[PDB]
Design an enzyme around this catalytic site. Sequence first.
Site, PDB file in Angstrom:
ATOM      1  N   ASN A  86       0.792  -1.278  -0.007  1.00 48.79           N
ATOM      2  CA  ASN A  86       0.452  -0.025   0.359  1.00 48.79           C
ATOM      3  C   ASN A  86       1.191   1.576   0.149  1.00 48.79           C
ATOM      4  OD1 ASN A  86      -2.432   1.824   1.225  1.00 48.79           O
ATOM      5  ND2 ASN A  86      -0.973   2.344   2.711  1.00 48.79           N
ATOM      6  N   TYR A 151       3.168   9.570 -11.187  1.00 47.18           N
ATOM      7  CA  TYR A 151       2.491   9.305 -10.782  1.00 47.18           C
ATOM      8  C   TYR A 151       1.131   7.796 -11.395  1.00 47.18           C
ATOM      9  CZ  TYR A 151      -1.200   7.706  -6.770  1.00 47.18           C
ATOM     10  OH  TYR A 151      -2.367   7.034  -6.209  1.00 47.18           O
ATOM     11  N   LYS A 155       1.257   3.856 -11.321  1.00 48.19           N
ATOM     12  CA  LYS A 155       0.159   2.676 -11.242  1.00 48.19           C
ATOM     13  C   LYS A 155      -0.306   1.964 -12.644  1.00 48.19           C
ATOM     14  CE  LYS A 155      -0.302   4.290  -6.612  1.00 48.19           C
ATOM     15  NZ  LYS A 155      -0.237   2.989  -5.622  1.00 48.19           N
TER      16      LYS A 155
END
Lengths: 251, 251, 251, 251
Positions: A86, A151, A155
């Site tokens: 996470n 970012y 991901k």
Amino acid sequence: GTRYAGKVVVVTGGGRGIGAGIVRAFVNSGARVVICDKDESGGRALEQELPGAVFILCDVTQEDDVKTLVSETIRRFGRLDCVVNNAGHHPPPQRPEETSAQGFRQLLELNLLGTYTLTKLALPYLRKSQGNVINISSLVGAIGQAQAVPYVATKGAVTAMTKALALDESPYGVRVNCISPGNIWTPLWEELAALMPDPRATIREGMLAQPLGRMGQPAEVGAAAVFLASEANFCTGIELLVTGGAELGYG
Amino acid sequence: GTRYAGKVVVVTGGGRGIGAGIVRAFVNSGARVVICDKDESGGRALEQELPGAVFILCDVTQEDDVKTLVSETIRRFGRLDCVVNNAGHHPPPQRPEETSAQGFRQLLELNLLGTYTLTKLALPYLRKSQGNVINISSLVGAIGQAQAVPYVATKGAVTAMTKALALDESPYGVRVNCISPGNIWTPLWEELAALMPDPRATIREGMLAQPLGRMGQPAEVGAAAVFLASEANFCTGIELLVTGGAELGYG
Amino acid sequence: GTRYAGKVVVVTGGGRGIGAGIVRAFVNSGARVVICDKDESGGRALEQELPGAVFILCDVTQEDDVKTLVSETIRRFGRLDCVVNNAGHHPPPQRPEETSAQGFRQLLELNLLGTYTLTKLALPYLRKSQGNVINISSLVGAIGQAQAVPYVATKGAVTAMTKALALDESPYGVRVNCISPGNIWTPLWEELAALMPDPRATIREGMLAQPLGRMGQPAEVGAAAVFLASEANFCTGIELLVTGGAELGYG
Amino acid sequence: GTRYAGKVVVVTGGGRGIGAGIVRAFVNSGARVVICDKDESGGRALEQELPGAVFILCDVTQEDDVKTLVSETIRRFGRLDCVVNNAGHHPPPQRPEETSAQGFRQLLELNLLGTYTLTKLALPYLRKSQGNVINISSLVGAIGQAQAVPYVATKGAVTAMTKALALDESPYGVRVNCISPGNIWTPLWEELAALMPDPRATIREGMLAQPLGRMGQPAEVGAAAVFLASEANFCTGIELLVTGGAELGYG
Ligand SMILES: NC(=O)c1ccc[n+]([C@@H]2O[C@H](COP(=O)([O-])OP(=O)(O)OC[C@H]3O[C@@H](n4cnc5c(N)ncnc54)[C@H](O)[C@@H]3O)[C@@H](O)[C@H]2O)c1
Ligand SMILES: NC(=O)c1ccc[n+]([C@@H]2O[C@H](COP(=O)([O-])OP(=O)(O)OC[C@H]3O[C@@H](n4cnc5c(N)ncnc54)[C@H](O)[C@@H]3O)[C@@H](O)[C@H]2O)c1
Ligand SMILES: NC(=O)c1ccc[n+]([C@@H]2O[C@H](COP(=O)([O-])OP(=O)(O)OC[C@H]3O[C@@H](n4cnc5c(N)ncnc54)[C@H](O)[C@@H]3O)[C@@H](O)[C@H]2O)c1
Ligand SMILES: NC(=O)c1ccc[n+]([C@@H]2O[C@H](COP(=O)([O-])OP(=O)(O)OC[C@H]3O[C@@H](n4cnc5c(N)ncnc54)[C@H](O)[C@@H]3O)[C@@H](O)[C@H]2O)c1
Ligand SMILES: O=C(c1cccc(-c2cccc(O)c2F)n1)c1cccc(O)c1O
Ligand SMILES: O=C(c1cccc(-c2cccc(O)c2F)n1)c1cccc(O)c1O
Ligand SMILES: O=C(c1cccc(-c2cccc(O)c2F)n1)c1cccc(O)c1O
Ligand SMILES: O=C(c1cccc(-c2cccc(O)c2F)n1)c1cccc(O)c1O
Ligand code: NA
Ligand code: NA
Ligand code: NA
Ligand code: NA
């Protein structure tokens, strides 16, 4: 209270936000949980609050910290059943010309390579327990986001790597899945909104970006993680969207 | 012979394989093409063969090489209309425990950050010409591949970054799209097959992985690139699959 | 035993197969369950076996049967919280030239319009309870299947309709989600295999189509349904794949 | 002017809108085009305007009309290379409780079964020419739309059926692909906007739903169709998005 009883879970970035929601969900399902975080403040308090959770200081970008995390988990609890990757960060909005290769590399170290390193070091123990890996990706890896090239790239990599690892580890019965949240109200969301010209407007826009008309809660991501670990025995390589419908329709 | 006449295209990794197919397709459509490659052998021969193509030696992982590439393109041709980020590499098959963070970082430098750096440096010129970017990703970024965790991660990142850049550059009219090929017969495919215990069996398996029963050709990826550059004026942020149906059905 | 206590669930096609697995999962979670089926044999036995399940004979292609089903559910239990649209059929393999418009229409009536009609009639009650709808689609609606044009079309429609309904019902807090199973061992799978030249080979091929190396069980789809109903409060319009990884990689 | 020279194309719904754009694109690429429409006004004018296009009155929901269409195409031109299934309709906005099973069936007849019937009847001729099928679906089949349950369902079915047919016809070398447009300015868009309380606001909202800040043109869908027919020889079963980026990001 028993759907994951007797199992051992490591949650990275577990000291606040989504990670703390995942920690709480697993403790409530009977698991023993190792909270991994680079910041002591939240994780130490959670260890005091929760029977069955312990805090280990660990920066997932430092290979030696991660080796220690895994060895200490086995020494203390005797097994490892689930790793939840996470820990991650979203930088402030940046136009492409404002980004740097240096900043991109630093974000890859945290959001992608930290997940890779812990997973790789944990796999021998997960293979013994027929355990599972849960990666926390993002909806924007699938659909894009403005002013967030680094970012979004990190991901997209996490979601794809999940599918590759699922193929590699399937012969051992180890499942590898990811959760892609949309807007979840966390301290990160609050910190990014505070940088905007009108934070209140940014938050209102964030609530209305979902057909359900609110942001999600950490507990909701936590429940999805417990499902994937404990009850999704025929799921591997999936991307579970926890977004309130944000990807649906025109806007 | 005129569907992209008068336009200037840079193709990275243009000296062989898919890249050379893309170079040829753009020359045949009337464009002037800069062949960028780190290896002189193929690119120099292509420059001699093709009216309208020129070779510039450039390693896309070296920021100073890329700055020179862009400045030389403008100095020689006066404009820049399309960047095709094709340079990339697929390592030999590796189980997760056989991969290294070091090798993963090196592959990210080529497959992801090289694409980022050239795109960023070219954007001021693409904004002036209302030009476009074409990234060459891979089907396996979408569906996974065994024994290829680092490669798959890099291509998932490229596909996602395409969507982010499309959002950022849409106000300028600059389109950003990617092509995700499946099995295309190239020298890389041949080199990887040669490492397998039975190369002939690997190649046969590669042909039969597609419902169409053959591998694709570089010229077919080239035609898709010319379409995206010249005729797909309402397409941005798309992933165009050139796979022969490999992602369809059960196997 | 209490994660859906006090709630009322209708499962269509609940007498055998996946539907019976879903019935069992909801009973075990504390719900009262209405088993809807056109065949009495399985559903009547399940009603005798399970405290908290009752059987109502209902052919979902007959509008008057469905009106009665909904009115009887409310009369008997006072509320309606969840509708699971599971009834459906897969015809034997058929090449396109072997299919008929008539057979296609008949399959649409069951696989698509039966789901539509029950959902529409239940919505006033689901809006009062802030309940949810779960549609059972199929992986092949997303990736295709050979010799199954009508079936694939019907399941692509169900998955898409799920997303449309999620948008429409979000203002009421009613969530609409679908589960797309891959190969699940059920009496339908057994009946279709029995038609093949070598049933044993067909079954072996069906087990090996998944990286996990087995087919799924009805109980596994049931657990996913209970999660969507009881714990997925920020999920609407999603397609949850329960496939064992069949959509991953090359084959 | 020669990229599809000598080939014969049938376009359904070719009298106006996207269909007329596709007709024009194929005529400009050297093909002979059969315009199929149920309305004479637009199609007859196009036949007079365009060398190489002919109009055949045909309602694609009437099986006998479609049989005649195919037989007349072969009688007049001697071959059939490409079928473009474009005819379809979007009803006015309807909440779920306002829709009817009857209206849903009628829309399935046009948007889905009309495409099925023509494709099935054309396949023997497409197999002889190694031709291809292009279905016009919709972005909303993938991402949903509010107040459009029947329409969305029909387009999800078309996209899925495309993938099934691609698998079935691959042994013959017949490719089957679909184009999923977003907002394209056509007479249908204009007619639906005219029903809204403020048509001007609806149109403005429709332009701003795309990052590119405009709606698409029929000619842009036409160019994509010509690419799929003439140059996409390793593409089968794909969904080509022509949406201006509408599916990207949050809104
Ligand atoms: N909040 C959202 O809306 C949202 C949406 C989609 C995805 N996500 C993802 O969810 C995850 C958690 O996000 P969040 O909003 O809860 O963030 P957060 O900033 O509130 O919490 C992140 C936690 O990770 C820890 N952490 C950061 N770097 C670390 C490192 N090097 N080693 C160990 N721990 C480290 C932090 O100290 C913190 O406790 C991230 O991966 C993020 O990308 C968040
Ligand atoms: N061949 C396939 O089946 C396949 C499938 C999907 C995607 N791809 C992608 O297509 C692209 C091309 O693949 P290919 O099969 O043609 O490979 P290839 O190895 O045949 O050609 C790659 C070319 O890139 C050049 N190159 C490598 N590193 C470079 C660097 N640092 N700077 C500049 N040039 C560099 C090489 O010298 C070579 O000329 C890659 O991005 C690959 O990931 C290939
Ligand atoms: N078995 C698989 O591998 C598989 C895979 C993907 C999706 N599915 C879907 O799962 C669902 C259930 O499949 P299954 O394998 O359990 O099938 P099954 O044939 O074993 O069970 C279907 C049940 O539905 C009932 N039913 C059929 N028509 C009905 C009608 N008109 N009204 C009411 N009930 C009716 C049948 O009597 C039966 O009890 C179907 O929608 C199917 O498309 C199945
Ligand atoms: N316009 C958009 O924004 C949009 C967006 C996505 C998808 N689409 C799809 O594109 C296609 C064309 O849409 P459009 O906007 O050009 O529509 P349109 O209404 O402007 O044109 C449709 C044409 O099809 C013809 N047609 C209708 N029913 C027919 C039948 N039974 N037999 C033969 N011809 C028939 C009409 O007479 C008309 O000439 C449709 O399938 C639609 O669903 C449109
Ligand atoms: O944390 C965020 C977040 C919080 C507040 C604003 C924004 C934001 C909004 C628009 C453009 C941007 O570049 C943004 F960074 N994002 C986040 C959001 C979605 C998905 C995520 O994965 C996330 O982490
Ligand atoms: O180059 C390859 C390639 C060539 C030969 C064998 C393999 C291969 C096959 C199975 C597992 C593996 O780890 C492999 F590397 N791949 C490639 C293939 C698909 C997509 C691509 O993007 C590619 O580049
Ligand atoms: O029931 C089946 C099933 C069972 C046995 C064989 C087949 C089968 C295999 C290959 C081609 C075909 O046309 C088939 F019908 N299918 C099924 C499978 C996957 C997804 C599903 O939704 C399903 O229902
Ligand atoms: O034709 C339309 C269209 C034109 C004007 C308004 C709307 C519209 C907007 C919001 C909700 C609705 O229920 C609508 F019908 N649609 C259309 C739009 C997108 C995709 C398509 O396939 C289409 O055909
Ligand atoms: Na504790
Ligand atoms: Na030259
Ligand atoms: Na009972
Ligand atoms: Na004419």
